[PDB]
Amino acid sequence: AIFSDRYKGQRVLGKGSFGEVILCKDKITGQECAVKVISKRQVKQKTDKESLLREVQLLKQLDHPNIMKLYEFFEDKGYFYLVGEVYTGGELFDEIISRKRFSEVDAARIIRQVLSGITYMHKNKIVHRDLKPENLLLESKSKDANIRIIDFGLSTHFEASKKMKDKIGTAYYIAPEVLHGTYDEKCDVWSTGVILYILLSGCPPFNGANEYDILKKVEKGKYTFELPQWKKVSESAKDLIRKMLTYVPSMRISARDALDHEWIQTYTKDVPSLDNAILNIRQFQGTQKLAQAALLYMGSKLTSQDETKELTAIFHKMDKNGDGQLDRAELIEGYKELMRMKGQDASMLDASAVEHEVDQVLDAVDFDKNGYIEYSEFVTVAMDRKTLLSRERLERAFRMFDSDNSGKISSTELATIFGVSDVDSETWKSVLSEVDKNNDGEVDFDEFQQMLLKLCGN
Numbered sequence: 001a002i003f004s005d006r007y008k009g010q011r012v013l014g015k016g017s018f019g020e021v022i023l024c025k026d027k028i029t030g031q032e033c034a035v036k037v038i039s040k041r042q043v044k045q046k047t048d049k050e051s052l053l054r055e056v057q058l059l060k061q062l063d064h065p066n067i068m069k070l071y072e073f074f075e076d077k078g079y080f081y082l083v084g085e086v087y088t089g090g091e092l093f094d095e096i097i098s099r100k101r102f103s104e105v106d107a108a109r110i111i112r113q114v115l116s117g118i119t120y121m122h123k124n125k126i127v128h129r130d131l132k133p134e135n136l137l138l139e140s141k142s143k144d145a146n147i148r149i150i151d152f153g154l155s156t157h158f159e160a161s162k163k164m165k166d167k168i169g170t171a172y173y174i175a176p177e178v179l180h181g182t183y184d185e186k187c188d189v190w191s192t193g194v195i196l197y198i199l200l201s202g203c204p205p206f207n208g209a210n211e212y213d214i215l216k217k218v219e220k221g222k223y224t225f226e227l228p229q230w231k232k233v234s235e236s237a238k239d240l241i242r243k244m245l246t247y248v249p250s251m252r253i254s255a256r257d258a259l260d261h262e263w264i265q266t267y268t269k270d271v272p273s274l275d276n277a278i279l280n281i282r283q284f285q286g287t288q289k290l291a292q293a294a295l296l297y298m299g300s301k302l303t304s305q306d307e308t309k310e311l312t313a314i315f316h317k318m319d320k321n322g323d324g325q326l327d328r329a330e331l332i333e334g335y336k337e338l339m340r341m342k343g344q345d346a347s348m349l350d351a352s353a354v355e356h357e358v359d360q361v362l363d364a365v366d367f368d369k370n371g372y373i374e375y376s377e378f379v380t381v382a383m384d385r386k387t388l389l390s391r392e393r394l395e396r397a398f399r400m401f402d403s404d405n406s407g408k409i410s411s412t413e414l415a416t417i418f419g420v421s422d423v424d425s426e427t428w429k430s431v432l433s434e435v436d437k438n439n440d441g442e443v444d445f446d447e448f449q450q451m452l453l454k455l456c457g458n
């Protein structure tokens with residue numbers, strides 16, 4: 001069975017752990033699904049084929065309201081196609097920051113759902129290991145929507161990326177025992193404890209100016225509740241967090257036992273709003289998403305340098321007599337040749353999607369698609385479109401982060417952003433000196449963009 005014989009791509013949702021995720025549709029039944037596409041060249045398997053196939057077969061039979069439903073699995077020479085149920089509510093934290101109030105009742109209802117999901121998967125001997133806020137999706141845009149946990153089962157069968165653009169926001173949530181090599185299902189309880197701590201305070205329990213500093217704190221395992229906003233929080237919530245953030249996993253509370261904890265029993269069956277927490281989460285989230293967007297922008301610029309020259313070289317080879325003109329079918333053949341090697345665009349997984357993409361570029365530049373075309377102009381527009389989309393994505397993240405609409409990001413804020421982005425301190429300061437030549441101690445959007453261009457060799 002071939003994935004593209006059955007499914008057509010609608011639109012790219014985004015890059016998640018291990019691969020890009022595409023909204024797809026069954027060509028016969030019209031069923032919509034969310035397909036995670038793992039490139040075999042970029043991601044290495046940890047287990048054999050026997051093991052992976054059996055896991056998939058088990059997962060397809062499992063069913064729980066707080067776990068993503070898996071429908072199908074496909075494999076070809078280059079990729080794995082993981083076909084799951086599509087959820088439309090987005091990431092939990094993105095919904096949380098938009099609401100006016102947030103209490104321990106809201107938090108307890110959220111955590112009960114997470115613990116219920118984890119409990120169920122643990123009964124079936126499946127461990128997540130990489131549990132974090134971006135793995136908590138809302139089933140729909142409804143106010144009361146269930147949480148659906150994504151990526152259960154993946155870490156067991158695939159090695160994680162070492163690229164920082166993939167490792168953003170991982171260090172806060174990882175259990176200490178995962179760092180040293182001996183771990184079991186209890187690591188998921190630790191990660192949920194970290195998430196709970198953040199839900200109630202808006203600040204990570206283990207924090208630092210860069211990834212390795214965060215990991216050092218995690219490894220020591222020590223945290224406190226001495227921040228002012230913990231005065232608002234019930235002792236039972238702090239007691240549960242303690243039990244989930246117990247260092248020795250054998251002494252740490254199980255997921256199933258946490259469901260029976262006083263705090264869950266009291267607050268899920270009077271309570272003020274955690275206003276300081278929601279403000280801190282908004283800053284946390286904003287900071288995290290801008291760091292991610294920065295890395296993705298820089299990644300997109302490098303992909304463009306690579307793809308522009310490769311696409312030009314492919315068409316040069318095709319252009320036999322060398323007059324620079326190729327027809328639409330040839331442009332498709334060359335663009336296929338390109339996306340064939342590169343694992344960048346997952347929405348270009350079959351010939352039909354490539355035909356469509358080529359037509360969109362020709363329609364943008366007002367070139368007639370039924371005659372011969374100046375390929376060098378096609379390349380420029382095809383790449384400039386991606387450059388523009390990348391620029392616009394970054395800008396939206398910049399505006400989101402700039403919550404007072406000042407138009408600026410301060411040096412203190414840059415340190416925070418670049419710290420999360422794990423860009424070396426003297427490196428970004430060096431680039432800031434290049435861009436900020438009046439010692440303003442702040443950058444507008446274009447200046448920020450220029451700093452990022454200088455941080456990826458431009």
Ligand SMILES: CC(C)COc1ccc2cc(-c3nn(CC4CCN(C)CC4)c4ncnc(N)c34)ccc2c1
Nearest residue numbers: 014015016021034036082084085086087150151153154
């Ligand atoms: C074979 C199993 C162990 C895992 O298989 C799957 C299959 C589909 C998946 C789909 C997603 C997924 N990922 N995403 C979107 C993320 C993609 C990146 N953006 C920036 C943030 C959200 C989804 N949105 C709606 N529904 C979904 N199911 C997803 C995540 C993990 C998945 C794992």
